[PDB]
């Protein structure tokens, strides 16, 4: 009758109970089991483990030991072929905006990350995994199939780390092993604040009573802000252009800088929390900057839950929002709010909206430049392109304007992230985010698609033909059935994401489900959820009620010109109309006096 509280966390706890505020650590949010959804505790796990030893060992990981009786197939080669395809035409959702993949990346990272292991600064243990591809401990290799393109001009594999798990972080023994998850389940905008005390408050401009976030000093945007360099030097974003030498940026969240996409939507969130604390300086001059900071971040943590509930997942889950995410009745202190470790997975499904290109926009939304259309995959880690060219403008305008990449059983994933993604780890453009993803579920221990068929109360097909019926394709189930010899066997992210979408959304049944519960959980067990009852008043919910993404970009970017609705495929300029004509965020609510 095994223990039941190990772990590695983030010490000094000591709770509140009163404070009308969140803590940075997600600690203190359930009054009950305070550390339920805090930041660096084991993921959840909605089914048991499934490793080759039981306990730790990936499947894969020993070649004589099958899953089922078969043998896996490589990851790469589930990656060749099933998911990808030369044809980018014709690729584009016609009716989803190039925001619709973005947004979801936040909301994302604003709910997990699953590190990798951590015992190599000063090591001969990252070539010893990069050079001789020799899988060991916690190098496991994506050894590359016979005929692949990059065995004759990149090597024999490519480097995958296991992810970190709990107690330790040094070769583990006893229970099942458990991946920890770097960040606070609650959406509460912990991308752009930082998980731990020790971030959120480096992230602060304590210079002053303002209660701002820290702003860059070195470039300006048009007297608008950028966030802050970073110090560490190593620089991935450095690396991919050593003539302009410009740092990533810093933030709450460490892959901020994955994306001159993703950079971008968090410059963004940072000049809102500055915007909304000068605002309410201005209105409130008595208050003093730890009040500035807290209800300005409080405001920023209920509009992501705004958008994301009102405006993004209704169009995922399509018409199965309402079977999963009733309407909101109020906190329920016995919803477990912790992210699951599918869900890491599950939520994976946007690697499949990612566009091959990257597009910039002068005002008259025409293309600002002679390249203003590039590649995908020149824009990992890549600040100067923001710094040196142009400002964040030129890129949301591309957002709003641009599609994102629409699913397609024929053509999932873009060479730019299949073949040329750049790692801030190595030093190529030649990495397979699919076999990443592949080679992640097997690290996670996670289980094989008909377990979670039978999870969600959907019909496990066992054989070829039961898949062709499940997935409506003959040559796809096909294809499946050879590489995994059982459906058994089909891993959950690529199991997942195969099945056609639901009724006007943009997943499967099985994603949506697994997509639902996740939500519904995170909402009702969140005491500090924008609408339960206390946490801000009916005056101000009616304020919130307004926000709008429109909104966001009008009052922090030099656009006038915005789609009433974001999310959806906008062509400019009939749908295009003045940020006059879109609500404002009304914070006269927020007023306050003593007597
Ligand atoms: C807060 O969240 C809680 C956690 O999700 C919720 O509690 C769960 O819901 C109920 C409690 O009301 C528990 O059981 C449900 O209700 C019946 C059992 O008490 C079942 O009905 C019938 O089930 C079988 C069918 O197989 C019948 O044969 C049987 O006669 C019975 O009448 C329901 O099917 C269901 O089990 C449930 O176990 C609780 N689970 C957990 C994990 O807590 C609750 O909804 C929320 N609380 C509030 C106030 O809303
Ligand atoms: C570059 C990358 C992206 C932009 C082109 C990108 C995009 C997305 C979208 C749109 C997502 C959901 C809507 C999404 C979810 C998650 N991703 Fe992904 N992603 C890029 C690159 C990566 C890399 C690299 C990883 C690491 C994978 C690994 O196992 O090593 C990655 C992961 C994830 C992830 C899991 C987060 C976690 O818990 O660790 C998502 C939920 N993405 N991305
Ligand atoms: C690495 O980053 C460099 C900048 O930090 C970048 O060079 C810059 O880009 C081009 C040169 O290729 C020039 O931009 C354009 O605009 C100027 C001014 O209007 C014109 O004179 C030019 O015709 C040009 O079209 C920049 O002036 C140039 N700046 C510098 C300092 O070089 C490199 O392209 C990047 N290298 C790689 C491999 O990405
Ligand atoms: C593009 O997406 C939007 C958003 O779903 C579609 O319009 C919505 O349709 C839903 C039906 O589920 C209605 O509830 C709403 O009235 C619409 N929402 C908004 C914000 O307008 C739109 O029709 C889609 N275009 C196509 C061709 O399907
Ligand atoms: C902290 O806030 C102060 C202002 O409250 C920032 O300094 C000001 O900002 C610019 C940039 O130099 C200039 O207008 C003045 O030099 C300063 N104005 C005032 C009123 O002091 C400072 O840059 C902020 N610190 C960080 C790290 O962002
Ligand atoms: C994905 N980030
Ligand atoms: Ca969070």
Known sequence: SWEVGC??????????????????????????????????????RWLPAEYEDGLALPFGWTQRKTRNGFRVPLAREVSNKIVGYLDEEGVLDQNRSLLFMQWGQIVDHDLDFAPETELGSNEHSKTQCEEYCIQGDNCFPIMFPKNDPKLKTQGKCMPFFRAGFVCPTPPYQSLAREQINAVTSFLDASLVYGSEPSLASRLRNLSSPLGLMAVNQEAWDHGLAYLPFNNKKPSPCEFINTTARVPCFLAGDFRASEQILLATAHTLLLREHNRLARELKKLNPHWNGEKLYQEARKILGAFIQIITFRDYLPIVLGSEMQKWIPPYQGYNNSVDPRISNVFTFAFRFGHMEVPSTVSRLDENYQPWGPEAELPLHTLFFNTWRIIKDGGIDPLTRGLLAKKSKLMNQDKMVTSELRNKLFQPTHKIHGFDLAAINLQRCRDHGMPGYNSWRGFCGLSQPKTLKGLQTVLKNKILAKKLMDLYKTPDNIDIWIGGNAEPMVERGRVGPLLACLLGRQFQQIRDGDRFWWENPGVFTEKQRDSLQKFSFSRLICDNTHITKVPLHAFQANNYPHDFVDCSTVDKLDLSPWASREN
């Open 7 to 44: 772990g590695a966390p983030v010490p000094l706890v000591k709770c509140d109970e009163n404070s009308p505020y969140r803590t940075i650590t997600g600690d203190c949010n359930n009054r009950r089991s305070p550390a339920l959804g805090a930041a660096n505790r084991a993921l959840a």
